[PDB]
Amino acid sequence: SKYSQDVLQLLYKNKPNYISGQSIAESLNISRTAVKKVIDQLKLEGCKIDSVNHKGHLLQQLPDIWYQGIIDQYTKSSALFDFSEVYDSIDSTQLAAKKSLVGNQSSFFILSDEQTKGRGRFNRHWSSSKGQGLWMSVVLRPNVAFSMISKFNLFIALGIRDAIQHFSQDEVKVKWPNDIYIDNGKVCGFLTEMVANNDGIEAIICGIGINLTQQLENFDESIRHRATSIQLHDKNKLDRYQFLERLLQEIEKRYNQFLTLPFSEIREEYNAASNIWNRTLLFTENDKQFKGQAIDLDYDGYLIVRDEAGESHRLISADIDF
């Protein structure tokens, strides 16, 4: 109802103690029995809430659904984000963020359980199933030249991989410049765009798609082989909210390093994290197609590549297949 998120928030705020119906009612100024309907609705949606006579209610577990009420708890404590927006379904969180950032200097993110026009790099289709992934656009406001887009991307990849790794029993690796893999499975793709002019960057907009709970039967047999989800490498249920916390934690960490460090500092780290060495890569550039080997990432994040004809290239970006 009008009050479902409010109650949800109060329940989450009060962990690991119980609060009575009564206490909630006084808080939102509503009847005890309206409060009982909101709770039955929530349980219906798959919240695990223990209700005990005389004692009240305790939130034990959130379902695979994003709730603004809870997300707002995350934003209030945030040193980075002014606010978030949370949808059940939308055309794309990047479309939404690119609209929201206009006319303001806010730092925010946008989550949605499903996207109906999810898009990746080069405007490829990005499958955004309901209930099954984190589909998020992050807007930040670093004031730094536009050239620095590329460097943002390098720091952020480690942010994302560290948080996925915290949950995967298997090795999570970066595939430069925008993919996160677990073994042979693409578990994430991120897209960093910006709004800028010559005098600088007006906003950065990072779109992050991370697969959380797909079973393989859940990917177009067609990609089933280079796709995977955090769940297929966690022995425990993967809690979507737990994960968001760690992801934000990592993004903040990794975003401050972006503002305070040259790429060389994390270059060796980034290197140990990647999965493009000692194997043959497929490169694509408008029309052209050719093979090569990655031999290094230089102090400036450019990839050094020896193509199939022995020629050397220094790439600030690429699209690479295995």
Ligand X SMILES: Nc1ncnc2c1ncn2[C@@H]1O[C@H](COP(=O)(O)OC(=O)CCCC[C@@H]2SC[C@@H]3NC(=O)N[C@@H]32)[C@@H](O)[C@H]1O
| Residues 180/188, Cβ–Cβ less than 8 Å | yes
Residues 39 and 102: beta-carbon distance below 8 Å: no
Burial of 14 (0-12, 13-18, 19+ CB in 10 A): middle
Under rule CB under 6 A, residue 227 binds ligand X: yes
Contact flags string 162-201 toward a second copy, x per CB under 8 A: ---------------x-------------xxxxxxxxx--
Name which of a second copy, ligand X, none residue 213 binds, using a CB cut-off of 5 to 8 Å depending on partner kind: none
Tokens of 200: 């600088």
Q: How many residues bind a second copy (CB under 8 A)?
A: 27
Helix (H, G, I), strand (E, B) or coil at 293: strand
Of 5, 9, 84, 94, the one binding ligand X (CB under 6 A) is: 94
Give residue 262's identity as a one-letter amino acid code.
Answer: P
The site partner of 76 among ligand X, a second copy, none (C-beta below 5 to 8 Å per kind) is none
Site for a second copy in 81-140 (CB under 8 A): 91-92, 95, 98-99, 102-103, 121-122
Select from 36-44, 50-58, 207-215, 300-308 the region that touches ligand X (CB under 6 A): 207-215
CA distance 285 to 235: 40
Residue 316 contacts a second copy per CB under 8 A: yes
Residues 222-251 that bind a second copy (CB under 8 A): none
By a kind-dependent CB cut-off of 5 to 8 A, residue 165 interacts, out of ligand X, a second copy, none, with none
β-bridge partners, 95: none
Residue selected from 127, 153, 165, 275 as contacting ligand X according to rule CB under 6 A:
127
Structure token digits, residue 86: 């949370």
> Which positions ≥6 away from 14 have C-beta within 8 Å?
58, 59
What tokens were used for 131?
A: 């209930």
Report how many residues bind ligand X under the rule CB under 6 A: 28
> Which helix (DSSP H) or strand (DSSP E) does residue 282 occupy?
strand 281-285
- Does 208 participate in binding ligand X (rule CB under 6 A)? yes
Q: Which two tokens stand for residue 153?
A: 């991307």
Q: Find the distance separating the first CA and the last CA of the chain, reported in whole Å.
A: 49
Q: Please give the residue ranges that form the binding site for ligand X (CB under 6 A).
A: 92-94, 115, 118-122, 124-128, 135-137, 178, 186, 189-191, 207-209, 211, 223, 227
Q: Please give the residue ranges that form the binding site for a second copy (CB under 8 A).
A: 91-92, 95, 98-99, 102-103, 121-122, 146-147, 149-150, 153, 177, 191-199, 202, 316-317
